[PDB]
Amino acid sequence: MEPNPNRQPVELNRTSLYLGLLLILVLALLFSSYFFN
Amino acid sequence: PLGISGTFNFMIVFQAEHNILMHPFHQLGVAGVFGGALFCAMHGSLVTSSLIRETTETESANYGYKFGQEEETYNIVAAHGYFGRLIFQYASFNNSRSLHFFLAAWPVVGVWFTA
Amino acid sequence: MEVNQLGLIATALFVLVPSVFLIILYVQTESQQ
Amino acid sequence: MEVNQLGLIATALFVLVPSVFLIILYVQTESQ
Amino acid sequence: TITPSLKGFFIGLLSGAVVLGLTFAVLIAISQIDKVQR
Amino acid sequence: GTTGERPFSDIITSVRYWVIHSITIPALFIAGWLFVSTGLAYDVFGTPRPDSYYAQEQRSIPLVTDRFEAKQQVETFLEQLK
Amino acid sequence: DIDGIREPVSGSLLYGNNIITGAVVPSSNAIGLHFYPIWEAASLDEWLYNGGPYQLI
Amino acid sequence: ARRTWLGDILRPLNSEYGKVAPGWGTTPLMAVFMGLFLVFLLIILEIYNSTLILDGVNVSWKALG
Amino acid sequence: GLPWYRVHTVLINDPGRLIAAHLMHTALVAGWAGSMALYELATFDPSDPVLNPMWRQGMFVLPFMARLGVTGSWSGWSITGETGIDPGFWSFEGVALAHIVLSGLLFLAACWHWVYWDLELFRDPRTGEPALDLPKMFGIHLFLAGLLCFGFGAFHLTGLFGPGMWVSDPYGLTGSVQPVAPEWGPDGFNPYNPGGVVAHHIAAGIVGIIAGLFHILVRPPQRLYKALRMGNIETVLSSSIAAVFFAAFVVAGTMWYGSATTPIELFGPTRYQWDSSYFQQEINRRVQASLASGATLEEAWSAIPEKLAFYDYIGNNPAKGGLFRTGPMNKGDGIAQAWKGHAVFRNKEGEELFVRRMPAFFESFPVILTDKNGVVKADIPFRRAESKYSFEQQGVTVSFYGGELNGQTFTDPPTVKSYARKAIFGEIFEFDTETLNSDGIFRTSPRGWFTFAHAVFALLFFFGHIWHGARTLFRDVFSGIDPELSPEQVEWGFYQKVGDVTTRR
Amino acid sequence: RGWFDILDDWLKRDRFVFVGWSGILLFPCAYLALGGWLTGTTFVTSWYTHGLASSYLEGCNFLTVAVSTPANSMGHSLLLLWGPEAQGDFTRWCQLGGLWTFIALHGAFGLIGFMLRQFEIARLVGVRPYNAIAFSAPIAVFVSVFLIYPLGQSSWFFAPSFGVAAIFRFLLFFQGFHNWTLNPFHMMGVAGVLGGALLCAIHGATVENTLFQDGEGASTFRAFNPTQAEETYSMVTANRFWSQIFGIAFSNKRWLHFFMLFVPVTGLWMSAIGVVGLALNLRSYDFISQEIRAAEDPEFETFYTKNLLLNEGIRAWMAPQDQPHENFVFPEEVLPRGNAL
Amino acid sequence: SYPIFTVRWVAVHTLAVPTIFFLGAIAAMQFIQR
Amino acid sequence: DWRVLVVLLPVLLAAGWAVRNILPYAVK
Amino acid sequence: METITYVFIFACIIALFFFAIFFREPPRIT
Ligand code: CLA
Ligand code: CLA
Ligand code: CLA
Ligand code: CLA
Ligand code: CLA
Ligand SMILES: CC1=C(/C=C/C(C)=C/C=C/C(C)=C/C=C/C=C(C)/C=C/C=C(C)/C=C/C2=C(C)CCCC2(C)C)C(C)(C)CCC1
Ligand SMILES: CC1=C(/C=C/C(C)=C/C=C/C(C)=C/C=C/C=C(C)/C=C/C=C(C)/C=C/C2=C(C)CCCC2(C)C)C(C)(C)CCC1
Ligand SMILES: CCCCCCCCCCCCCCCCCC(=O)O
């Protein structure tokens, strides 16, 4: 049985890393007050 | 106040002492920022709608643009052809300079008034 | 202040888990190049 | 049982942090 | 039995039908008259 | 850059346009005027006139309080003005 | 004491605020529009009670 | 591809990919059923809304006894 | 390579691994179900279904097992309070275990289908390419859905071969699992009629069987195949998402307004029962009936069951909570212990006075007492210097009939004000605030939390429908527009019909 | 070549106002929604549902006219003209609030028609459907605020009334009763709207100030041709400027314009979610930690406790007139008030 | 040779005709006394 | 009632006058 | 503990600013 032909590399460039970490950190900053309540 | 809830306190007391909602300069500020958000979405969606096919479906279409390329990355005539039919022909820009000047002017001017 | 004790672990995993996800994808992107 | 409430976060991070470290090193090995 | 609101329901139902059928009737006629040339 | 209809600018500078519309516009204006001046608008829409928001010695709002008798309630309020 | 009535409003995280409720509180009404730099206070304790940091910022 | 016993049994159920009936086929009949179902859903909605009130249909908890 | 937000598109042309993914998702969901049930069992107090029912305890999946006939624990208790019972294997614990075993089995099948992805079943025999005949798959799956829907109504719900479902009286006092006979007349479309739920599953099940037969035997017309891109599995995702957000809105609505399938002993009262004083009217109806047959005040109110009094309390109203006020209702006002009795207020002249109840809109509400005509006769004033209606000036007193304080009268103004502050909430209960360290602030019930989540997911799934439907009808330009688009196609007048090159002028 | 294709032909003709199949839904509903609002604001009272005047005919101006919600006693009645409340009487229908449901429902179906029109035209022209997708956000706002919100409350009475001032009253209601400014979903909406406006202004100004000299005139507009292939401004100089001014800049034009779609669309979607919660009174009203401390410690004060006093004033001072069906009678002595005022 | 009556003509007058009528009615209203 | 005819008269007259002035070109 | 958490997240954001500016992927012409 052949290997699966549908497999694909995935990527996240450095700018997307920075944008995502910023999103997550700002969301946590926003929601943390409500989690502690 | 330099705080999040302090900002709200300021807004509420401003409304009781000045009835800012019934003031036309605040109403223009709302039109400035609502229209600003609207036209942000419009421009973003019309340019994104008319990107020229430069990539495969397995890759971000953003890789179809290279920093500094001389050619435009979307087709403004197709965007205009779509938006002018959405409304009518003459409510759509076909001059990119007039379009981006309008983008600049509307929220700036509305926020001048609200300030 | 009498805050929700679980707010700390909630905040910690809310930061940690998606951040780790991005870092994993970033680092394996660099090592392809 | 009256257990220590920082026990939960200490155990969770004790697992997560070194586990993630290894996962990071392994995945970038496979893609190179 | 057939209550006042069920009667109103049928009125609303027939009025909608009239509006849609009249609208489509007119739209078909115009499209038959003024066709595109290929 | 055209789809076949007559340009607007050509229409509203034309003489025939203004021969029709120097009539149709004031007519429509006067019609709306009369709709109000005759009092018809009050009757069609049920809008109180300035003398019919309250009964003379009443200061309560004739507020509808029932869903399925609402119609009869409004009618009962109005008769308390006649 | 934002409103100059000796009714001090707590704005910082260590005095019981979170991110949403915290603030640097405006200077005292007792000061009005007077310039209140640090060197005009008899002490930092005084400057902090009356809202000096707001003006500086 | 791998053949299996269950596979060979199920085979004809996945053997007519792309087969269509010509033109409009049963589309006129489908539209009839759609329109009936719309009316049916209107009725049910307006019963719940108390816009359609029917004899012996008390839209209330008190309809549990 | 693929951006992060597209990793799962590798399954679009891989039916085996698509099945493996669907199996893994099904294992995860079944596993959650079993885990959630075990957690609820470990925290549920079954010792008082009158004043500490499941819905006061933040129970979420317990009421769904009870709704369809699971009512007892292997531990010997049942949720209706019967003790010393034997459920057999389909206890709460056995249902939880089954889902866990089911999860494990699905997970192994997921592994097999992932490894052995290249099954000949998935290949088009003519072209050799992976292909699914989606029209026929739909008729098969619809036929199956129809058989299950029919059986569920014809056997489980009727009690012909099954337990029935939860049914109750209109005031949520005596509910239980009972077989339900279908209602075939127009009252079967009444949301509050349980017989309609039976008839619906029987009829819809037969209709599903018949439509399924149709969809196995009749090919889709060519006009419709091309219009809906029936060769593209993503059109199925688009319409399936739409059907699902439709379903989600419906179950949010019926949860919120109440229907025969969201009974109040399992999910709590609705806010509309507070709005309309639904339970207070019934209570008053009974007290008036006991008085007419000659009972004293003490006797008539003592006949009011505690369970009914407890419904007439704003703390069980699901519209009194907040988004980040977490946990069971018991964490807020506490664990209800006892009805204190019905408070009657009178002024110094002996008129009965009535506390104006808090509406659900208000976090805080003032204390205002009215006579039968609605005329204000006493309050707790804010500014004291010009007060006319204070309790002190009017000589307000409170007497209790029924409950724990039955026959007791209080006259010291501060105590009287204290009960007046509670009476705005409805009937007055004693709470244990210590056991859970309750903070005294109202939380919403499972009825509230379920409606919220399902209304929000429904709205979000509407975006998914728009997204995947767009991707289906615009697959050809997903990656951008034709770089050889000529301006005559998008300019005005060139073609008579927009985008139709055969209509050139 | 039957009637369906012939009608398709005619619907999709290139004309001054494109029609399309979507036009059959859009044009009647949009015009009726619009016409109902102008009719009501010009002629129709709110006396029997609200105890308010609300038309030009009655003396109101553009800011205070409204088509107001129906009476709380109608519940969530569709209030069909031929329904059991108005019983086919147009006049009573107007006085009972029927124009409100008329406008909201026709407006809803008009919104659907407009988004279908975006799909239809984009398919015919050959562009991607991202304008349609962007429009999901105003749809979500409309349905959450005008439909879902009052559906979780007691009646349509508590939806927004269609008027300038009446919306102002809606905002203030939400402050006092829901403490909506404290809600992180509204906050995300605020960031999305303000962030979108910022993006709009900063992108328009950057382009206009990084233009290439492509003509000799001092009016730089004339030096653009819609069919030119060349970018009309320098991405490279714009990137340098913003990198040195702000630290970071865009470098990808496609990302830039997608981001401009993303920010305000996401913000509006977030706020819709919060309003769905408020349909159930599922508010972010309080911080429990703050209330416990403040209850025990009368010297503890924050901008959070100050704003709740304002909410308490809003509720007590506006409820009797804003909710006349409740027959709230608050004697002077119970009104919360500070010193002197 | 331009056509007179068009879809456009209908759209235009669908809005224009009531607009003038409403303007007339609103003008009359400025002379109403209480 | 009579107020309806009063309102509707200018509209009918204006519609008549437009018909008269446009009829020849509408036939074409 | 809540104060520590708030300040920790804030300081992580500032640190991120530093990498995003000085250790960005450099824009490269065409
Ligand atoms: C052998 C099968 C089986 C059985 C008997 C049960 C039994 C049960 N499950 Mg479990 N479950 C199973 C498999 C099973 N499950 C699987 C495979 C999964 C993984 C998906 C789960 C996941 C799961 C969850 C997540 C939960 C349960 C729960 C429950 C309980 C409540 C059931 C309920 O309310 O359903 C509700 C029924 C529906 C939602 C069905 C609506 C279906 C829609 C309307 C049909 C869609 C349209 C249709 C196709 C059109 C048909 C056409 C028509 C013309 C015929 C009950 C004890 C609940 C519980 O208490 O857990 C402890 C719970 O929360 N189950
Ligand atoms: C439909 C889903 C559903 C529903 C309605 C409930 C409902 C309930 N659960 Mg259950 N639960 C669920 C799923 C669900 N659960 C799942 C999947 C789990 C496993 C994690 C649990 C685990 C669980 C436990 C362990 C407990 C409950 C408990 C409860 C009760 C209290 C809930 C509460 O306080 O919420 C609080 C809810 C919130 C604070 C809302 C959170 C909203 C988030 C923060 C918003 C995120 C926004 C996002 C970041 C924005 C991004 C935008 C941008 C990036 C694009 C209640 C009856 C409790 C109980 O009483 O048990 C007896 C309890 O102890 N549940
Ligand atoms: C039955 C539901 C369903 C299914 C099977 C899919 C399937 C798919 N989607 Mg759609 N989608 C859906 C619902 C669904 N979607 C809904 C409801 C929305 C609106 C929110 C969308 C919006 C959407 C967009 C905008 C896009 C897709 C895309 C895709 C494809 C790639 C997804 C991927 O790689 O994610 C990868 C995702 C991750 C690696 C992480 C996601 C983490 C999220 C933010 C939070 C975690 C959720 C949590 C774990 C559990 C969920 C709880 C609850 C929902 C049960 C794939 C075919 C993409 C596409 O078209 O590519 C061509 C794409 O761009 N989807
Ligand atoms: C596409 C256009 C369109 C759409 C979607 C709507 C939609 C709506 N209108 Mg609006 N309306 C329209 C055009 C439209 N209208 C036009 C053109 C006018 C001017 C005439 C109006 C005037 C109007 C008024 C005055 C009112 C509405 C109302 C309504 C609502 C209720 C509709 C209803 O119950 O229909 C029910 C009917 C149908 C859905 C039609 C079903 C078709 C069936 C299947 C055919 C049945 C066959 C036939 C009857 C058999 C004949 C047998 C015979 C020989 C006996 C809904 C929001 C009401 C409203 O807003 O309430 C607030 C209301 O009072 N409409
Ligand atoms: C810095 C100030 C600020 C900012 C930027 C915002 C921003 C926002 N607020 Mg908040 N708000 C604020 C302060 C602020 N708010 C304060 C202090 C309060 C007091 C508590 C509120 C109370 C408040 C409420 C009560 C609500 C908002 C809502 C909103 C959102 C409105 C979204 C929108 O465009 O709706 C505009 C409406 C639409 C997009 C709907 C569809 C519109 C269609 C397309 C209309 C088409 C028009 C048609 C052509 C006919 C027009 C012709 C006619 C005019 C002649 C947005 C996130 C709303 C929200 O969150 O919604 C979910 C909401 O209901 N705000
Ligand atoms: C293997 C096997 C087995 C076993 C099994 C097991 C052991 C299993 C388990 C399972 C399980 C145990 C599972 C679980 C699951 C879970 C889940 C899946 C979860 C989810 C979650 C989520 C999703 C969440 C989310 C969220 C959050 C977090 C927050 C809030 C919001 C939300 C809700 C969204 C057996 C023996 C049978 C047999 C043989 C084989
Ligand atoms: C509801 C209804 C209906 C319908 C109706 C309609 C359809 C109507 C329409 C109406 C209309 C359609 C109206 C219109 C109006 C308009 C107006 C009233 C306008 C105004 C304007 C203004 C005043 C403006 C001004 C200005 C300014 C201020 C500035 C600039 C310039 C100008 C000029 C723009 C029917 C019958 C079905 C029946 C049922 C009910
Ligand atoms: C499918 C879309 C339906 C569109 C048309 C629906 C409404 C059309 C007009 C119907 C209302 C006018 C007649 C009904 C007036 C009621 C009088 C009566 O109850 O006897």
XYZ file of N, CA, C and O in Angstrom, chain A residues 28-29 32 36, chain C residues 7-9 11-12 15, chain G residues 13 19, chain M residues 1-11:
92
model
N -5.856 37.299 26.974
C -5.700 36.879 28.375
C -5.744 38.083 29.294
O -6.432 38.062 30.329
N -5.082 39.177 28.880
C -5.091 40.408 29.652
C -6.505 40.919 29.817
O -6.890 41.353 30.909
N -8.613 37.913 31.952
C -8.157 37.476 33.270
C -8.951 38.112 34.400
O -9.247 37.450 35.403
N -10.872 35.844 37.378
C -10.673 35.995 38.815
C -11.939 36.514 39.459
O -12.249 36.155 40.592
N -9.344 30.960 38.731
C -8.992 31.932 37.701
C -7.526 31.885 37.317
O -7.160 32.210 36.195
N -6.666 31.481 38.234
C -5.241 31.437 37.932
C -4.928 30.331 36.938
O -4.230 30.560 35.941
N -5.438 29.118 37.178
C -5.128 28.052 36.230
C -5.858 28.322 34.945
O -5.346 28.061 33.864
N -6.456 31.290 33.512
C -5.612 32.242 32.798
C -4.320 31.606 32.298
O -3.918 31.837 31.157
N -3.668 30.794 33.127
C -2.392 30.179 32.741
C -2.516 29.253 31.520
O -1.690 29.296 30.610
N -3.310 31.257 28.298
C -2.099 31.778 27.665
C -1.278 30.637 27.093
O -0.933 30.640 25.910
N -3.456 48.322 41.210
C -3.676 46.882 41.341
C -3.412 46.391 42.762
O -4.154 45.555 43.284
N -7.513 44.846 36.135
C -7.173 45.576 34.916
C -8.333 46.431 34.464
O -8.141 47.463 33.799
N -1.888 36.997 44.042
C -1.665 36.208 42.868
C -2.253 36.838 41.600
O -1.711 36.703 40.518
N -3.353 37.557 41.728
C -3.973 38.135 40.543
C -3.085 39.291 40.073
O -2.844 39.447 38.878
N -2.542 40.065 41.014
C -1.662 41.167 40.628
C -0.458 40.655 39.858
O -0.071 41.222 38.828
N 0.156 39.585 40.356
C 1.304 38.997 39.677
C 0.936 38.574 38.261
O 1.742 38.707 37.332
N -0.241 37.955 38.101
C -0.690 37.493 36.794
C -0.882 38.658 35.829
O -0.362 38.644 34.718
N -1.619 39.685 36.245
C -1.803 40.865 35.400
C -0.467 41.466 34.959
O -0.276 41.804 33.783
N 0.481 41.587 35.881
C 1.721 42.252 35.512
C 2.567 41.339 34.643
O 3.286 41.794 33.744
N 2.507 40.040 34.890
C 3.249 39.092 34.047
C 2.805 39.165 32.595
O 3.632 39.151 31.684
N 1.492 39.175 32.350
C 0.998 39.247 30.971
C 1.405 40.557 30.325
O 1.853 40.601 29.160
N 1.289 41.645 31.077
C 1.715 42.941 30.569
C 3.190 42.919 30.168
O 3.567 43.423 29.110
N 4.051 42.363 31.020
C 5.475 42.346 30.699
C 5.802 41.436 29.516
O 6.739 41.728 28.758
